[PDB]
Design a protein around this nucleic acid. Structure first.
Lengths: 175, 59, 209, 142
RNA sequence: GCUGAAAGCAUCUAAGCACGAAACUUGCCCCGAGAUGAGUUCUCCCUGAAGGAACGUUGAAGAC
RNA sequence: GAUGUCGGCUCAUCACAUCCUGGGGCUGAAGUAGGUCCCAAGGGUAUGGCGCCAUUUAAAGUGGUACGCGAGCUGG
RNA sequence: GUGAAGAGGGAAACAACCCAGACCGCCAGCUAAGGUCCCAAAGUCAUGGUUAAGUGGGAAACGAUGUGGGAAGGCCCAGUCGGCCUGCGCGGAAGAU
């Protein structure tokens, strides 16, 4: 509610194409369209899209909080983008970024997976991977793709983890 | 059988069966259901006049 | 892809050079000829219909004679049809040879098995046998109990009992091909194909790996 | 004198087309089963069929309310030893939409020879193009 | 699990989206238009026909 | 003025409150080997001796169906 | 009180439950218990609300920011906080054709 009422500045270099219930922001980082809940009435005025509730609708401002909240990414990530960081500690697992293909060998066959279009991976060091992208929902999903292979085992900490995540190591069963 | 016959022939003219009998009772007409059903089968011209009178007398 | 129609002849062995016998069977094939081609724009499936053999003038009826004479081919013992494999095209009147089976190396053989008549339960479903002594009377090979008491009251569908055994269509998979003789028109395949001598066998490439 | 009974030879039958995009199931099948039996004519007789032929278009576009999209299960028994089969609504409407309509109208009609004689009239189609254009059907709004 | 408000933060969920079992529907083998919804294609005969049945020699088909 | 009784042989059917095989959470879970719980009923589940023993196996699950089954057999 | 010694209508079927005591007849009407979307005669009727669980169409001790209405408060230049009475829901909830 308090996040709903605050006007978020939408800068230039963008388009506001209200094609009905669907919104096109064809611009610097592509489009994102979706039948918007028939409750959130949207209206273009000035560097912002005003959301209110339409009558007879149960959620109303509850859905308007979503329309300002998850589509705040629609405002910000088009011109700024987002960047994620991953690391791994412990030696014995190799995942390599061959173009849009990720290959991996872990003492198992090597397994493959794929990278979408608007994501670019860089390895400034042999252990640290930096991912650049366009959408929060896509970079989070490719993070869930990359982390699930060698998830951090909590005794000696070995595996693939985040840069800022904390993982608590513990003892190894004295008697 | 007769009730279903009168109900179909009355719903053909824009009034349900209950309002039809209510209007006929208020308008002081004592034709029972057999003669009503036979008239509704054979000649529609008298039946629509009866329905119109019931509609006028109801409201 | 498309197979062949042949006739089982017998069973023989083949000696390899290192001294290992290989039990094979021999299928004689005459050159099958394409009589009809179907397609998607008129029926709804792509398949060719072929014939083989030779038949007499009297035993062939008039409409079959006209239907063969449209394609211009001679008569045949029987008609079969194979589903086309989505990207092959063959004309009407072309003879399908035996050279086609020089690369597949894994075939399955389809045919009609033997028939053993009204065989009993022990031969058919592999039941077991009660004791032959220690008081056993008038019961050595009967099936036995066939269900419950005053609860289901009915024998369930699909109960295993006596009946006709054999004479059924069947298919044996993953048979190795061994020797293809395109001059005398023979096919020697390792294994045991179904059916008595003189039947009709259908040889197809194996649909599995 | 006597109450007249509608003879089978002299009866007359029409053709209708029902669009079914965005309709609910029950309040469409009720009118279909009402018109098929012949209760909307003044010639009604309970032992003689007097209904009307009905064609239904866009059967795959029918809609249902609430969580009946997934919860509603359709069962049948194969009659064999220990088998029984179930299917949800989504899998059935993806496989065939004719059975969804034809299983709902069937229960609303009487049981017996007249039930099958009445059910023989209704003819549903999955798409939007019917092949009965020679009988000149009239579009009816239900 | 990802994004995400109601509840300025947080959250697998209320809106949308991604994984996930010898289980489920397919896939493999056989029966299968008496499916009365009785389907499809090719040829043949009709201004005593096309064919079918009876009889005979019989079969690695078979209780008849 | 009749509903044939316990165990064994042949033949099965179903449920899941799961013995093996498949998917996970927690662990006082270094690994191996374990303990318990969540999901899962497609397939399988031993032979001899007088409740116990000897020896195999991944396993030798719990149960209703007149404590299944004598117009099928046994009379112990 | 009913059945035994009583039929009819309703409760899917249901001697003892609810309405009601059959001399005979007719293609006439008004009602009782129960009901008005189709099977199956009659309201897809009228006005104001509640439930989102197929609750309605089976159940306990106990548990939880589900949801409507009401009374009383503490702090505060735009609200927040958890205590009480109350209507409707949710988990607790596994069987053998």
């Amino acid at each position: 509610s308090r996040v709903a009422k605050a006007p978020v500045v939408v800068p230039a270099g963008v388009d506001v194409k209200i094609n009905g219930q669907v919104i096109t922001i064809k611009g610097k980082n592509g489009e994102l369209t979706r039948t918007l809940n028939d409750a959130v009435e949207v209206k273009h005025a000035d560097n912002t899209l005003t959301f209110g509730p339409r009558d007879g609708y149960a959620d109303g401002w509850a859905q308007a909080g979503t329309a300002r909240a998850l589509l705040n990414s629609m405002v910000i990530g088009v011109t700024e983008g987002f960047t994620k960081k991953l690391q791994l500690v412990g030696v014995g697992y190799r995942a390599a970024v061959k173009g849009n293909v990720i290959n991996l060998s872990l003492g198992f066959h090597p397994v493959d997976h794929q990278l979408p279009a608007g994501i670019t991976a860089e390895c400034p060091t042999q252990t640290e991977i930096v991912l650049k992208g366009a959408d929060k929902q896509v970079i989070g999903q490719v993070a869930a793709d990359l982390r699930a292979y060698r998830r951090p085992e909590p005794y000696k900490g070995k595996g693939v983890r985040y840069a800022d995540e904390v993982v608590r190591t513990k003892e190894a069963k004295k008697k | 059988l007769w009730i279903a016959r009168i109900n179909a022939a009355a719903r053909q003219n824009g009034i349900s069966y209950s309002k039809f009998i209510n209007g006929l009772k208020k308008a002081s007409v004592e034709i029972d259901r057999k003669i009503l059903a036979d008239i509704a089968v054979f000649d529609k011209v008298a039946f629509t006049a009866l329905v119109e009178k019931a509609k006028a007398a109801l409201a | 892809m498309i197979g062949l129609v042949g006739k089982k002849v017998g069973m023989t062995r083949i000696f390899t050079e290192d001294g290992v016998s290989i039990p094979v069977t021999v299928i004689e094939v005459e050159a099958n000829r394409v009589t009809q081609v179907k397609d998607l724009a008129n029926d709804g499936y792509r398949a060719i219909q072929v014939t083989t053999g030779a038949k007499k003038a009297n035993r062939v009826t008039k409409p079959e004679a006209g239907h063969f004479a449209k394609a211009g081919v001679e008569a045949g013992r029987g008609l079969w049809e194979f589903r086309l494999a989505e990207g092959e095209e063959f004309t009407v009147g072309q003879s399908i040879s035996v050279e086609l089976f020089a690369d597949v190396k894994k075939v399955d053989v389809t045919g009609t098995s033997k028939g053993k008549g009204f065989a009993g339960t022990v031969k058919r479903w592999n039941f077991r046998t009660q004791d032959a002594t220690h008081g056993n009377s008038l019961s050595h090979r009967v099936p036995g109990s066939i269900g419950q008491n005053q609860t289901p009251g009915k024998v369930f569908k699909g109960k295993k009992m006596a009946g006709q055994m054999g004479n059924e269509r069947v298919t044996v998979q993953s048979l190795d091909v061994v020797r293809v003789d395109a001059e005398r028109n023979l096919l020697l395949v390792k294994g045991a194909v179904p059916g008595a001598t003189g039947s009709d066998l259908i040889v197809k490439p194996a649909v599995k790996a | 004198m006597k109450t007249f009974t509608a003879k089978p030879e002299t009866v007359k039958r029409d053709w209708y087309v029902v669009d079914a995009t965005g309709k609910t199931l029950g309040r469409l099948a009720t009118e279909l089963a009402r018109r098929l039996r012949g209760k909307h004519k003044a010639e009604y007789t309970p032992h003689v069929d007097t209904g009307d032929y009905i064609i239904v278009l866009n059967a795959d576009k029918v809609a249902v309310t609430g969580n009946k999209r997934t919860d509603k299960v359709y069962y049948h028994h194969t009659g064999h030893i220990g088998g029984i089969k179930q299917a949800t609504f989504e899998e059935m409407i993806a496989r065939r939409p004719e059975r969804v309509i034809e299983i709902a109208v069937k229960g609303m009609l009487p049981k017996g020879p007249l039930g099958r004689a009445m059910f023989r009239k209704l003819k549903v189609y999955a798409g939007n193009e019917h092949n009965h254009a020679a009988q000149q059907p009239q579009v009816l709004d239900i």
